[PDB]
Amino acid sequence: LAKRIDAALIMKDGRVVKGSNFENLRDSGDPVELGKFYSEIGIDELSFWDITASVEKRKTMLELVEKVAEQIDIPFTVGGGIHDFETASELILRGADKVEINTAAVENPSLITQIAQTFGSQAVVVYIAAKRVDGEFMVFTYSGKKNTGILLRDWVVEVEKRGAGEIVLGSIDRLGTKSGYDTEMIRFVRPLTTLPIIAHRGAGKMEHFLEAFLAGADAAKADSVFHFREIDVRELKEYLKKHGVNVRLHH
């Protein structure tokens, strides 16, 4: 399949955290307007991550999903504190194409299977945050605070066995950096799974996306480099096509 370019948006209380630099938008911090714009200029899929406070979170995420499904015609994923099947279900039914889970999946891998059995594997995205510790890739939960002691190698295989549809591979060793995606980590995971691999963390320039795809990623996700206009999405896709990457340009 064509390589995918994904834009991630962090949100809180229905607002894009730290907004964006697109002066042309009516509200540069509105996730619906920003997402529709990305879909117009060439983003392939959107992912929304919510960090709203606990008492308003459930209704806030449902309203978000409802609004973006109305206005956007590319697939989108929703995530952020999704801990059980009922929460995932009502978000998909309200409009999301996919849900993203991480900590709750590590603590109860059967949750992956639970969601897939009603919504299909393609609705389940598992985010794996990994980091080198004493020479081994380890899986971390709770926003990177807990070394689970689980080897990246083992968790990737279990995630696929449990029925996930795709994996986001986030390198904690690259967060906040602009030196490139963790291509060693991507190459390490690639032989272990047939699932689509979405690269995350470290992107700083268009060449980093080419590197990630050469490493075996099926998609590359980024956020601030797009929102603050360090990389133009249309230029990025033209650059990748130029150098041989296959990218795309109900009763």
Counting the structural domains of the chain, the total is: 1
Residue 92: give its domain's CATH number.
3.20.20.70
Q: What's the reported resolution, in angstroms, to a tenth?
A: 1.8
Domain that holds residue 94: 1-251
Whether residue 3 contacts residue 240, with contact meaning beta carbons closer than 8 Å, is answered with: yes
Which tokens belong to 198?
A: 């979405």
Question: What SS3 state is found at 55?
Answer: helix
- Paired with 136 in beta bridges are 133
Radius of gyration of the chain from its Cα atoms, rounded to whole angstroms:
17
In angstroms, what CA-CA distances link 88 with 9, 92, 168, 240, 242? 19, 6, 18, 34, 39
Whether residue 46 contacts residue 35, with contact meaning beta carbons closer than 8 Å, is answered with: yes
CB atoms within 10 A of CB 139: 22
Rounded to the nearest angstrom, the gap between the alpha carbon of residue 69 and the centroid of all alpha carbons in its chain is 17
Method used to obtain the model: X-ray
Whether residue 219 contacts residue 198, with contact meaning beta carbons closer than 8 Å, is answered with: yes
